[PDB]
Design a binder for this molecule. Structure first.
Ligand code: RUB
Ligand code: RUB
Ligand code: RUB
Lengths: 458, 123, 458, 227, 119, 112, 123, 119
C-alpha cells in the first residue's frame, strides 16, 4: 500500500543476493562516494537513477512490476585506499533498452547518475553487452574479414597517413599529397578529423581531387587504393550528401568521427554504408575528454563496444608507444573486444566481463599518434596484422617527401613481417630488423636518421 | 634526395617491397603458414595480373581480384616441402604466369597470408 | 626551406603578442601539465594540435599560409592554488570551421588535444563564439519569445513534470498519468530521458494515448497544454519518423537528448522543428560525464553554447538545490548565456569571454532534479520567469496524486510570483509565503508535511 | 585432408554428446524412417540436409568451420510402435539464420528434408526459438495489452462474426450486415478469408460501406467498433 | 479452395490432386517473367539441357569463397551456378558482399570461356 | 490419368517454365536425365561438381562433357536408357575430368 | 589431378566440349534437325567471335549475340547434303570466320539446335 | 530588348518607353493566376474599391504583434492587411511564425465581421 515520501535507495535497488541473467546489461562503475554515504546506498543510488527509480516514493510504481524492470546493484567490491572507493556491479534488464540503439543504452546507464552531489566521482569502466542485445544491432557494415576480401589485402597490418597541415590545404593540394602518398606504397590516405568542408576547402572539390588520385595511383601500383573521405557534418542531410558523391565516385571508403557527430548520426551512416557498399572509418575525435581520468568518466572500452554495435570498419585504438596516451595491457584488452567473437573476463587488462559478440563483425583497430619508422615492431607485435597503422608526420616529414616517406614505412612494415614470420622476436630484435632493412632501402634509411631519438615516455 | 619512379614499380601486396626471397625464405613463409594451422593453396593468372574495373564500377567493386585455382587447397599437408613441389609445377605448366602462395584460416574464414611466388619476365 | 625534424611547438604556436580578431574563436583551457613541461610548451602543443600543426615538420605547410590559419595560444594566466595548473588562451581563426556545425567546431577544439601524453589533465571552460560564426546558425527552433507567444503563457516560470517510474510504464498508464498532471495545473508533462521506444512500451502507442490526454486536459482546464514527446532514437530515420507523427498529431513540443542523440542529429531535429513549427525540449543526458570534474573535461557552459547554436527550445540547466550538482553563481552565468543577447566578461561567474549573440533566440532554462514544493522560491529567485520548473517526484509523489501534486506546485509557484511582485523578498521570507499559502490550498499543505525536512546538501 | 565421395551422415551430424546452447534453434521432428534406415543415420540425414551438409564430400567444407555451423542431431527418442518411429532432436546454430526472417528460418529447417526418399515420413512438431533470435523480430505490431488499451475493452473475451455467405454479397450489402451486427453488441465484424476484391465486390467499395458502418454503430452503442 | 476445407472434423484426410485453371482466369496473369523462349534467346543457348550447380556447403561459406567457387564452376563449363535455398543474408555472409564478389566472378568466367554466364 | 493429369489444361499462350532437376544427381545420372526432361531443362549438380576429386573447374567439365556426350548420341540415333552407361564409358576415354568422377560415384544409386 | 586451362579454351555452346565434329557427325546433327522438323539456317561471324558488351550493359542485354545470316533459312529442304553444301560455300568465301548451323521449330518459334561448324585457325 | 543597348559608348542616354506585345506571344503565357473577375468572385465583394493597409513599422514587429495588428485592422473593416515589401523572414520575426499568427487573425476577424478577409 502506497506511502508518500523519501526512503533509502538500498531497500529496492541493492540486491547482493541477485543472480545476474544472460539478458542483463552488466555495468561496472568505479564509484568514489561522499563522506558518510555507505557503499550499499550510493551503490543503490546509482542503479535507481540509471533505470526506474526516483528520489521519492511515487505511486505509479504500483501500476507496473519493479521486480521485472529495476536495475539492481548486486555486488560492491572494495578498491585500495580511503577514498573508500569501490566497484559497484549493476544489472539492468533487457526490457529497459531500445533495440539497435547505443543512444538509448548510454542515455540511461549514463544519463544522470555522474551528477549526484552525493558522490565525489564516478566512472563507468566496462558493460557486459548481453548477446541477445548484440543480436539487435547491425554493427560494422563489413567487418575485418569482409574488408580484406574487398581490398584483397592479406598477411600484414594496413597503412594510412592523415594529411597535413591538419587544416589550410586546397582540394587540388590535398589530392596532390594523397597521390604522392598512395603511389609510394600506402594502403590508405585520410582527411584529418578537423577537415569536413571549410572556407579554404569545400568538400566536394576535395572528394574530386582525391578520387582522381585514388585511381591514378591504383593503376600505377597495381595495388587497391583508398582515401578516408570524411562525411562527418553539421546536419544529417549534409552527412548523407557526402557519401552519396562517394558512392557515386566508386571509392572504397568513407570516415566519420562518431562521438562529435553522435551515435544517432553514426548508425544511419553505418546503415547507409552497408546498403551502398562503403567501408566505414572511425576517428574517436573528442574521446580523451570523456576517457582520460582514472576516477571519473567512461573508460575507452565502453566507447569501443558502443562503436562496434553502432557500426564501423575501423576505430582508432591508441598507439601505445605514441604521443597520445594508452597503456599496453589495457590496450590489448579493448583490441580483442573490438576484434574477437568471445572475450574472457580479464581484470589485469581490465576486461571486467566475459564478452560474447555471437558473430557480430570485428572492427579493425587503427593505430596512429606521433609514431614513425622505429616503433614498427612495437606496432606489429602489439596489434598484429589485424590493424591499420597510420603515419601523418611520419610520412610528410620524411625528408625526400611523400612517395619516399610512404616507401620508408611499407618496407619497415614488410621487414617486421618477414622477421616475425621467420621466427624472430619483435620485442627484442626489431631495432635491428629496422637496421637491417635500411641497407636495402635508401628511403627507409633517410627517415631513420631524423627520428633516431624521438620517444614519448611519461 | 631521391625520386621514387612513377613507372615500372608494379607491386603484389605483402612482401613485394622487400628483395625477392630465396627458396630458404619461400619455404620459411610456408613453415609459418603451416605452424599456425593455416592451409596453403596456389593461385595464378595469365592475362591480367593487376586490378582494373571493366564490368561495373560501384564502391567496393573491382575486377582482377580472383585468379585461377591451382588444384585444391592442401588439406592434410604437414611438411613445407609439399608446397614448393606444387609451386615448381605450376611454373612448368605456365612459365609466364603470376603465382601466389595463400594460406586459409578456416575458423575466421579469411586468407591469413598471401605473397607472390613467381612472375613471368616481361611487361 | 623544408627542414625535416622535430621542433618545439612553441616556435610556431605560442604567440604572446597576438591581438585577437573579433572573428576568432577563443578558448580558455585549464591546463594541468606533467612534470617538467613548461607552460608555454604545453599551451602551444594544445594550440597546434587543435588547429594546423603536427608532431614533426611537414613540407605541405609551405603550400599554404600557416599565419592565416594556425591556432594560436595567445595567453597564459598562471592559475590560483593547483601546482601548476594554468589557464591557456588560444585564438582559432574563423576559416577553420564549417558553417552550421557544432560537431566540426567540437572536432578541432576538443578532437585530441585532451589525450595529450605530455599533460596530467585538460578542461575546456569557455568558448567565445564570434558573432560571424554564430550567424551560420539557425539556432533555436523558436526561442523564449515565440515559445511564450505560441502558448499564450506569460508572467511566471513554466511548470513541468517528468513521468515516473523512469521506465516500465505502459503506454496507456503514461497517458492517464499525463492527463492527471496536466489537468491539475501543469503546463507541461514529459517522458523521462530513457523513454524512447522499448518492449514495455513502444513509441507510437505512447504518442497517440499521450496526444488524447494533452487535448482532454486542455479542454478540462482551458489552459494550453504540452506533453514532451521523445524523438530520441537509434537512427535519424527513426528520430525523424517520430516528429513526423508528432507533426501529424498537432501537438506542441517534442524532446531530444542532444549529447547522446548527438549534434549532427540534433541540428537535423531543430531544422524540422523550425520548418514544421515544433517547439523542442532539450535534455543533457551524459553532460555530467564531461563537465563534472574541476581539473579535466568540458564545463557545462561550453556545452550550453553548443546547444544554443545547434538548436533547442529548452535545455536542462540544473536545480542548484536539488539532487544533482550545479552551483549558483556559475549556474547564474550560464543562464544569461542561454538566455541573453549579450553577456560581458565576468569571472566571478566563470564567464571567460564576452559573448555577443547577434539576435540568435534564447533557450529557456529548465530546472529539474530532486526539487519539491518547498524549493519553489529559492527557485523563482535563481531562474526568474523565463524558466521551466520540473517536478516528477514533486508531483507524482504527492499523497493525493497527480492532479493535486500539480495543484500543490502550481499554487506554490504562483504564491511566489505575486509575493515577489508585491515587493516581498523571496529568499529571506521564502518559507512563509508558502505557509500562508498552505492555508488556502489543501493540495499544497499536504505536500509540505511529506517533504518536511528533505534538504539536498553536500 | 580432402577425400572425394559418399560417407554416412551420422559421422558429422549425429552428436548424442552435444550440449545444446541458448543460441541454438532446437527442432523436434517426428520421424518415420524407411526399412533398414537406422535412427542415428536418418536422424543425421535430417540435420545435414536442413543446414550445411550434402550427399557427398565436398572440399569447400575445409574452407569453413563445420563445428561452428552444422546443425546436429543430439537426441533420438523412441516412439510407441513398429513403425520404428522416433523423435530426433536437432540443434541449429544462430549463425545459420537471417535476423527477423521467418522465411529464412522455415526454408531451412523445413526446405527439403521431408522429401528424402529415405524416409516414409516426417513431422516438425515444435521449435525452440532461442530468445537471442526472438529479439531480432518486431513480432505483433501491438500485442494483447496494447489492443485492449486502444479499444478500451476489458474483463471479457472479444466477439466477432465473419459475414456470409462467404462470397457473393455486394459492398453496400456487406456493410448493411456489418452495421446490423455491430450495433447488436459485437466488438468486431470480418471479411471471410475468401473475400479480397472480386467481380461481385471490389474492395475499396467494401472498405467504404464498412466504415460508414463501423461508425454509425460506434456512436449508436457508445462502444468502440471494428471490422 | 484450400482455406479451411482440409481441417474439416467430419473427415479423416483431404488432398488436392489437380486444379483446372480456366483460360479466362489464366489471362489475368503476367505469369513467367520471360518463359523458356525469351530465356534461351537472351542467353544465346540452344540444343541442350542447361547446367547448374548449387554451391556447397549449404551455409557457412563467406562471400569471398562463394565467388572463387562460382568462378571455378562457371569457368569449367557450367551455364549456371547458384546460392542454396537457405542462402539469404546471415552473420557468416551478408547478401550485398556475396552479390558483388559473385558479379565479378560471373563476368571473369564469361570472358574466360566466351560462354554466357549466370549465377 | 495415367500421369495424374485430372483435367485438360489450356494455357492460352502463357510462357512455359523450364524445369530444374537437382538432388543427389551425378555424372552417371546424366542420360536417364536427358531421356526424362529433354532439352528444355536445367540439370543441377552441387555434389556433382563441388565433390569431383579435381575440383570445381573439372567437376564442371565432367558434367558438361557427359551432358554433351548424351545430346550427340541421342541425335545420332542412339537409345539413351538402353545404351546409357556406355555413351559415358566411351566418353571417359576422351575426358580425364569425366572418368575420374565415375570412379568416385561408381555404385551410388538412390533407390527406395 | 589435372589443372584445366584458363586460356586457349574458349567455347561455342552445345557440342564444343567434345572433340570437333567430323563430317559424319556434322551430317548426323543435320539429319536430326530435319528428322525433328526444324528448318536449318547457317550464320557467320568475321570479327568478335564471342560475347561482349560495348553499347549498353543492363541485365540480359548482350552484344555479339547476333551473327550475319547466310542467305535464307532452308525452307524447302529435305536432304542434309544440301546444308553442308552451304557450309562448304560459306567457308570457301569466309575462311577467316565463325560459322554456326541452326534450326528453327516454327510452332514454338525458337532455335532448337545450334553448334559450331567452322572456326578461323585459332582465336 | 534591354540587355546591352543602354551601355553603348556612342550613346548618352536611352529609355524604353513602350513594348507592343503582339497577341501571338501573349498566348504562351498564363499571366495572372486568377485576375480581377475571378478574385472578386472568390472574395465575394462587388461595387467598391478594395481596402488594404500595410503593417507598420516596416520591419521590427514580432510574429504575435504582427497578428495582433492584423486582427485589429481587418475587424474594423479592411478587406486586406499585408506584409510590407521587406518583411520576409528575419531574426526579429521568422516567417512560419507570422504566417501562423496571421491566420488566426484573418479567420477571427472573419467570424467577427462576416466579410471575407485576407492578408
Ligand atoms: O592527427 C593525428 C596525428 O597524426 P600523426 O601523428 O600521424 O601526424 C592522429 O591520426 C589522431 O589525431 C590521433 O587520435 P586517436 O588516439 O583518437 O587516434
Ligand atoms: O529525470 C530526472 C529526475 O526527476 P525528478 O527529480 O523530478 O524525479 C531529472 O529531472 C533530469 O532527467 C536530470 O537531469 P538534470 O540534472 O539536467 O536536470
Ligand atoms: O540443395 C539441394 C541439393 O543439392 P545437391 O544434391 O546437388 O548437393 C537441392 O538440389 C534442392 O535445393 C532440393 O530441392 P528439390 O528436391 O526440388 O530439387
Amino acid at each position: 500500500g502506497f506511502k508518500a515520501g523519501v526512503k533509502d535507495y538500498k531497500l529496492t535497488y541493492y540486491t547482493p543476493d541477485y543472480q545476474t541473467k544472460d539478458t542483463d546489461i552488466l555495468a561496472a562503475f568505479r564509484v568514489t562516494p561522499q563522506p558518510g554515504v555507505p557503499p550499499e546506498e550510493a551503490g543503490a543510488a546509482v542503479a535507481a537513477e540509471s533505470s526506474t527509480g526516483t528520489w521519492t516514493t511515487v505511486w505509479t510504481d504500483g501500476l507496473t512490476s519493479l521486480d521485472r524492470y529495476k536495475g539492481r546493484c548486486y555486488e560492491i567490491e572494495p578498491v585500495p585506499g580511503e577514498d573508500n572507493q569501490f566497484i559497484a556491479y549493476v544489472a539492468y534488464p533487457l526490457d529497459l533498452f531500445e533495440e539497435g540503439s547505443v543512444t538509448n543504452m548510454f542515455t540511461s546507464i549514463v544519463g544522470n547518475v555522474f551528477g549526484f552531489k552525493a558522490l565525489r566521482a564516478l566512472r563507468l569502466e566496462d558493460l557486459r553487452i548481453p548477446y541477445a542485445y548484440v543480436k539487435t544491432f547491425q554493427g560494422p557494415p563489413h567487418g575485418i574479414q569482409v574488408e580484406r576480401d574487398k581490398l584483397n589485402k592479406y598477411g600484414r597490418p594496413l597503412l594510412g597517413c592523415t594529411i597535413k597541415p591538419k587544416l589550410g590545404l586546397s582540394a587540388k593540394n590535398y589530392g596532390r599529397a594523397v597521390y604522392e602518398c598512395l603511389r609510394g606504397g600506402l594502403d590508405f590516405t585520410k582527411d584529418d578529423e578537423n577537415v569536413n568542408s571549410q572556407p579554404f576547402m569545400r568538400w566536394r572539390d576535395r572528394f574530386l581531387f582525391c578520387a582522381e588520385a585514388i585511381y591514378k595511383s591504383q593503376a600505377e601500383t597495381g595495388e587497391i587504393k583508398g582515401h578516408y573521405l570524411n562525411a562527418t557534418a553539421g546536419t544529417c542531410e549534409e552527412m548523407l550528401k557526402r557519401a552519396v558523391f562517394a558512392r557515386e565516385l566508386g571509392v572504397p571508403i568513407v570516415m566519420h568521427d562518431y562521438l562529435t557527430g553522435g551515435f544517432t548520426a553514426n548508425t544511419t551512416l553505418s546503415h547507409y554504408c552497408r546498403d551502398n557498399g562503403l567501408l566505414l572509418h572511425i576517428h574517436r575525435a573528442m574521446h580523451a575528454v570523456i576517457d582520460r581520468q582514472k576516477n571519473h568518466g567512461m573508460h575507452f572500452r565502453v566507447l569501443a563496444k558502443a562503436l562496434r554495435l553502432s557500426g564501423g570498419d575501423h576505430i582508432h585504438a591508441g598507439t601505445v608507444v605514441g604521443k597520445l596516451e594508452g597503456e599496453r595491457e589495457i590496450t590489448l584488452g579493448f583490441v580483442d573486444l573490438l576484434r574477437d567473437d568471445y572475450i574472457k573476463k580479464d581484470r589485469s587488462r581490465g576486461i571486467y566481463f566475459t564478452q560474447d559478440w555471437v558473430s557480430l563483425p570485428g572492427v579493425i583497430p587503427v593505430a596512429s599518434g606521433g609514431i614513425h619508422v622505429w616503433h614498427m615492431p612495437a606496432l606489429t607485435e602489439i596489434f598484429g596484422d589485424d590493424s591499420v597503422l597510420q603515419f601523418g608526420g611520419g610520412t610528410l616529414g620524411h625528408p625526400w617527401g611523400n612517395a619516399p616517406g610512404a616507401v620508408a614505412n611499407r618496407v619497415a612494415l614488410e621487414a617486421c613481417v618477414q622477421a616475425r614470420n621467420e621466427g624472430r622476436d619483435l620485442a627484442r630484435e626489431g631495432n635491428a630488423i629496422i637496421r637491417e632493412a635500411c641497407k636495402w632501402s635508401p628511403e627507409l634509411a633517410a627517415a631513420c636518421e631524423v627520428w633516431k631519438e624521438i620517444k614519448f615516455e611519461f | 634526395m631521391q625520386v621514387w619512379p612513377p613507372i615500372g614499380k608494379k607491386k603484389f601486396e605483402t612482401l613485394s617491397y622487400l628483395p625477392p626471397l630465396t627458396r630458404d625464405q619461400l619455404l620459411k613463409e610456408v613453415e609459418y603458414l603451416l605452424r599456425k594451422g593455416w592451409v596453403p593453396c596456389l593461385e595464378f593468372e595469365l592475362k591480367k595480373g593487376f586490378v582494373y574495373r571493366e564490368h561495373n564500377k560501384s564502391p567496393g567493386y573491382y575486377d582482377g581480384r580472383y585468379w585461377t585455382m591451382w588444384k585444391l587447397p592442401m588439406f592434410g599437408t604437414t611438411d613445407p616441402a609439399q608446397v614448393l613441389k606444387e609451386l615448381d609445377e605450376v611454373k612448368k605448366e605456365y612459365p609466364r604466369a603470376f603465382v601466389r602462395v595463400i594460406g586459409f584460416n578456416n575458423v575466421r574464414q579469411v586468407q591469413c597470408i598471401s605473397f607472390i611466388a613467381h612472375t613471368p619476365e616481361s611487361y
